[PDB]
Design a protein around this ligand. Structure first.
Ligand SMILES: [Zn+2]
Ligand SMILES: [Zn+2]
Ligand SMILES: [Zn+2]
Lengths: 209, 209, 209
């Protein structure tokens, strides 16, 4: 009757000679119905909600910074980062200040319910990635806001910008023209409130396990 | 090897002094791979499918009426409903005839696969919320239809209207102009059939547990 | 403390006199946190990822061909295929060369993370169904590409075409006009690489169980 572990090593594959187990800070809370697999780093005070799936078995590594949250049904996965010659595929590798990642999720970042960040991708600190939104082959700057159902594919979202709900951004020209987050923007304080809440949820939930 | 309960209390937090466990009608069926947490009310004959996540740990309470269904990977969650003074945040509280809710899902409502209703939100009786659709900060009337991939954010959808597939409705002006459901509309009988089916699935599945 | 099986029979219902258990090739890998229910056929070398839900309890049967993959949070489900007279509802039945299915997923097909194929539907061989995409009441040909967040509802996508990211195709006229996949198209080699990877992941993961 379905006996198993939800935090585990990635399997041996032609691009993964030696398996890795997730490296998770004692202060992070991983829901029992979340799945965390392979070459993953999870930082302090991170909340991982039911049904999230963080799978570092193809592209690796996948890093989630401190005080960030990975909400219900969020998926983190990436395109192959090493070839057949054990050759790093640089096109599928993201570089975040001297360190290489398949997926890099910064500090104080919110991955809201049912969103997905697929590598190669980087999401900078204090950014809110909206409900059902999508990031793939992109670098989202810090202090950004992806409204619900927006997407960034193959682009760089400059620091401090936002993507209106439903908008799919596929070109650098359009990413260059995004609106700026200002004090009066409707999602201007959303991330700070969410981060506050989720740090407190992680602690509350750690006291139930 | 991952030992746990999928129906459980919310954690103690600064806004939740005392934990609550879900209140679920004996005739509802909660799939073993669904997650139901915290201040939740689930009505009679409700079917909750694999991978759904109903989490009342921030905004609360979350109510699902009789004969409604919460399909695979559907997420129900809400913005904080109480502040730091144990102060009710009225902007994040929905009012459904004398009673206050973070998320209110009426009777005979279908939350189709991978949709999401995030509070503050109310969905009126006999409404079909389409596959992958999204409701957030909105009141959807009764006898409505959100086609697949449609969304209602920050609006009121009048009774008897529908939102074409893919359409993101963010303004009251646009919500005011939605088309009416008529006998010949393609989704006119969709909800009644779905409700019929899911009430019967709940009973069938209850006989397997 | 939540004791259960993730691969199981569908329940007895008015349209399902006798329950069926999934028929899964020994070489397929079904993640322990995936759910597979009812009248399902899973072919060889298929990888089913965490949080996927394949549920054949309404419309049936649901078939997934050899060397195909059903990624994280993907949902497969279908509209009722038999009435009250045990009457086959031909409108909700798809025909794939002499055999009838509620959902037919061909060989070497990739159902990428958080996508969904809802029957009646057929997806032809070597097609990539993008992240968060949607197929419902449609026949997607072989060698197609649904980019991330695209959708096909009520149409036939001819062989060798693609749907740009975010595009919702609801009419045969628009499906007739889709662009062709060519050697230089950005997703032209995507499916073959994904299929290669997932066949190898299935084998790797089978060696961990
Ligand atoms: Zn992937
Ligand atoms: Zn939420
Ligand atoms: Zn369905």
């Amino acid at each position: 009757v379905d006996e198993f572990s939800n935090i585990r090593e990635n399997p041996v594959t032609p691009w993964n000679p030696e398996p890795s187990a997730p490296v998770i800070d004692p202060t992070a809370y991983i829901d029992p119905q979340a799945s965390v697999i392979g070459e993953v780093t999870i930082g302090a005070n991170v909340m991982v909600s039911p049904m999230a799936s963080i799978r570092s078995d193809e592209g690796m590594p996948i890093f989630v910074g401190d005080r960030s949250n990975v909400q219900d049904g969020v998926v983190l996965h990436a395109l192959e980062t090493i070839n057949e010659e054990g050759e790093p595929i640089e096109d599928n590798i993201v570089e975040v200040d001297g360190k290489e990642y398949a997926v890099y999720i910064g500090n104080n970042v919110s991955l809201a319910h049912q969103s997905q960040v697929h590598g190669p991708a980087a999401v900078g600190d204090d950014t809110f990635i909206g409900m059902q939104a999508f990031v793939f082959k992109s670098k989202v700057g810090n202090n950004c806001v992806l409204e619900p159902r927006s997407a960034a594919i193959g682009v760089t979202i400059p620091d401090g910008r936002y993507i209106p709900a439903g908008m799919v951004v596929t070109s650098q020209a359009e990413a260059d023209k995004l609106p700026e987050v200002t004090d009066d923007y409707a999602y201007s304080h959303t991330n700070e409130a969410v981060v506050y809440v989720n740090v407190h949820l992680a602690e509350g939930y750690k006291e139930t396990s």
